[PDB]
Design a protein around this nucleic acid. Structure first.
Lengths: 78, 90, 100, 89, 90, 97, 79, 83
DNA sequence: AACGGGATTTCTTCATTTCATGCTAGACAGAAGAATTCTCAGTAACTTCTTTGTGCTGGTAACCAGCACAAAGAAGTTACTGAGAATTCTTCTGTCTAGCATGAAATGAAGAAATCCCGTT
DNA sequence: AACGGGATTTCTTCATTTCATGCTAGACAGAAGAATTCTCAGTAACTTCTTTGTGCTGGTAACCAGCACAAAGAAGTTACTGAGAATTCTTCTGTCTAGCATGAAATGAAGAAATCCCGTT
């Protein structure tokens, strides 16, 4: 499932940031990382959602959660 | 509800020939609350350190003073300590 | 008779005031705090839309989209500071590269 | 594709990681913190997730590619995208 | 008035043999405080987000889950979960 | 005392006030300040538990800030929590990469 | 010029204690450099506080609140 | 590499006080009276800054292979922290 | 440059805000005891100094062991597009609880004294 | 090892909880709305997944070119007290100066489709 992220995908990213030669393992050092992230981010954003006793996570359910990791996402205020 | 409509009129103020989208409206709208939340906060953290149980126009001042950097700060002051006056005397 | 046009402001003195008593940031709010604050947000709100609108013109465009707010921010000494850990949506990035 | 494509995407603004493979991905990592349940994900709440996840890998890449160019190289390594994830907190 | 009368009470509870320097007592209280806040903090905020003016124990619990890491979470919660009932059934 | 019913040691009483006085709300539950008092006690007894083992570990019978600094950086679960903190007079983890 | 109150031997202690071995040459100014955008940055956010309640006496607590506003909590000075 | 295991084992604030004390009131006078206590807090936090600063910065020196610090480092370091 | 499907505008409402005054109250400007913050001076005296050298380390090529970008290919995977069901957030309406007030004592606590003792000298 | 400055302990008056009893409010419990989000189906439409081919990037071992650690015999100037000298936090008082409280009337701001309209196809 993790292989959901292709090669040029992770690359494009790695490219946007200004990277020339994208090494080997890198491709999995992203599936790896992006995994730690969506984790700490979804577990947070889900606890808030189980508080309001909801079966649907809310846009705001996530944002509040980034706002805990130290990332203030903007464009979504419900 | 939200600041959207206010974020619009003002937009027209400093820029008439210009427009906006809706996502870029979402951000504005996400911007306002983001600064509100910081100012009223650190201003709330302010009226607290000094036992005062009320937020003065001075709290919000020394509060902005502490949240907005060098040059951004100075101008939010003159738009404030000049918004209290034209509110009081008139 | 609006408290906002009385302070010469566009941004709601009224709303903010209330928005200031609910989140319980205290027990009592001045009569000037919710007219000073609301005026600071107007500036900042007009402070970005100022630039983000410009870049829009420099980008041969007359429509504020998320991308324009991105450059308005990342191309201003003060803003970037303020908006440290902020992440604009559909923002994109500054076209900066560097070789050996 | 070097000095040529590493200036097309910066100019771009959209997503880079396909929506659905990611969508599927969130719902699963969602399956853990719930005792093993389903959970509706605002189509809205999903994009948000990514928008940030992206600018997190990008910035986290460039914020590291300056670590590669330090040891005098031009090839990002899993050596770099872990030094910073230890030089940030 | 500070908690150093309670921090110490717990101190020689777990190591009734050991003492403490008044300088660690500064860390102690500074800490307890830094913790009281962060929890009651994101609780004010949690009762706030889900439109209410009440902070149940239920809040000061999802408030902890969200702040205390790993097993420091799955233990402090059953330390409250346990300390609240024993209260009700006073 | 109320900490008696809850069977604590940390002021279920004080917290309640310190909790309605901080304006964290305008209406405070009755289980809340009782709960927080227990959660505070745990964590505080918690860290001491380590501060004081490595205190007898490092051959010393009195707790100094240094010991608090060690229980911290030596608890996978505590260092995470106490990320943005720094103890007054506490050196560091003797570590030469 | 009181930025020289910090010295080659002193900067070497912090450098050394930080797991640093063979220090470089200019790290005896770099220090004198950042320590001045830290202290400077922490002073302001901390002075305004003293300047808010009112007085000419900056307490460890005017400071500590400055360090929290900083994103760097400090322990052992409260009240 | 002698003192390494001497100071790691200690806690005494390395930089003297007085030098520092003026260094502060100076960036202060740019805007009083300082409880002698508060000058420690603006100290303990000060050195605590530098310490974890080189440390975090040396990994930047031991990544390019190097073993000798360089300002080249306390600028890539302070750069990945956003400070 | 020809269009796809968002902004931009009107036009009507349910609320939210502004009103009007009477009040409890947080607040403030004039007294003042005294903790300290600043300092001068000392006798201590630790530290930072200044330096001549050579050791151990960094700066460049050299010559090269493999790695990663460029394709021309092969055909499975992302998009959504609905639409039904429905899986569910969301409201609603006042009983049943539940927590806020206001006090009057009644204790749990902060703050000095003085013996009693751990771990820098 | 040994005694010097920091607790540990025990005592006292004092502020802060606490239980009484309403008094509002706040949570609540199903009944169903109005949402939108899961569900599959089912196609269309790229975008992925190769499989060499190999340019040249990263090494790794050499050499050259210096930069940095090292006591040392000192005296600069940082500690540490001590006593002030007295500048100023802080606590009080009493009365100002003021935001809180309604009870509703009214003006405002959020919403529901519809002609125009700007980047993008």
């Amino acid at each position: 499932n993790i292989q959901g992220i292709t090669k040029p995908a992770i690359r494009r990213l790695a490219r946007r940031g200004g990277v020339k030669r994208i090494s080997g393992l890198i491709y999995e050092e992203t599936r790896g990382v992006l995994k730690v992230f969506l984790e700490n981010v979804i577990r947070d954003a889900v606890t808030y959602t189980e508080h309001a006793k909801r079966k649907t996570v809310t846009a705001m359910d996530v944002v509040y959660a980034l706002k805990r990791q130290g990332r203030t996402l903007y464009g979504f205020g419900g | 509800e939200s600041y959207s409509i206010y974020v619009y009129k003002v937009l027209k103020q400093v820029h008439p020939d210009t427009g906006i989208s809706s996502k870029a409206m979402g951000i504005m709208n996400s911007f306002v609350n983001d600064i509100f939340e910081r100012i009223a906060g650190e201003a709330s953290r302010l009226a607290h350190y000094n036992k005062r149980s009320t937020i003065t126009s001075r709290e919000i001042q020394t509060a902005v003073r502490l949240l907005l950097p060098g040059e951004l700060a100075k101008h939010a002051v003159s738009e404030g300590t000049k918004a209290v006056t034209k509110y009081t005397s008139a | 008779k609006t408290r906002s046009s009385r302070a010469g402001l566009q941004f709601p003195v009224g709303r903010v005031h209330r928005l200031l008593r609910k989140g319980n940031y205290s027990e009592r709010v001045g009569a000037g705090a919710p007219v000073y604050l609301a005026a600071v947000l107007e500036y900042l709100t007009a402070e970005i839309l100022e630039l983000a609108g410009n870049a829009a013109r420099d980008n041969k465009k007359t429509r504020i989209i998320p991308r324009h707010l991105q450059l308005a921010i990342r191309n201003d000494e003060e803003l970037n500071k303020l908006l440290g850990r902020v992440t604009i949506a559909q923002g994109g990035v500054l076209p900066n590269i560097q070789a050996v | 594709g070097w000095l040529k494509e590493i200036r097309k995407l910066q100019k771009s603004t959209h997503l880079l990681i396909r929506k659905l493979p990611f969508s599927r991905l969130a719902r699963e990592i969602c399956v853990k913190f719930t005792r093993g349940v389903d959970f509706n994900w605002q189509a809205q709440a999903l994009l948000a997730l990514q928008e940030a996840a992206e600018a997190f890998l990008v910035h986290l890449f460039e914020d590291a590619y300056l670590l590669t160019l330090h040891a005098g190289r031009v090839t990002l390594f899993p050596k770099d995208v872990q030094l910073a994830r230890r030089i940030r907190g």
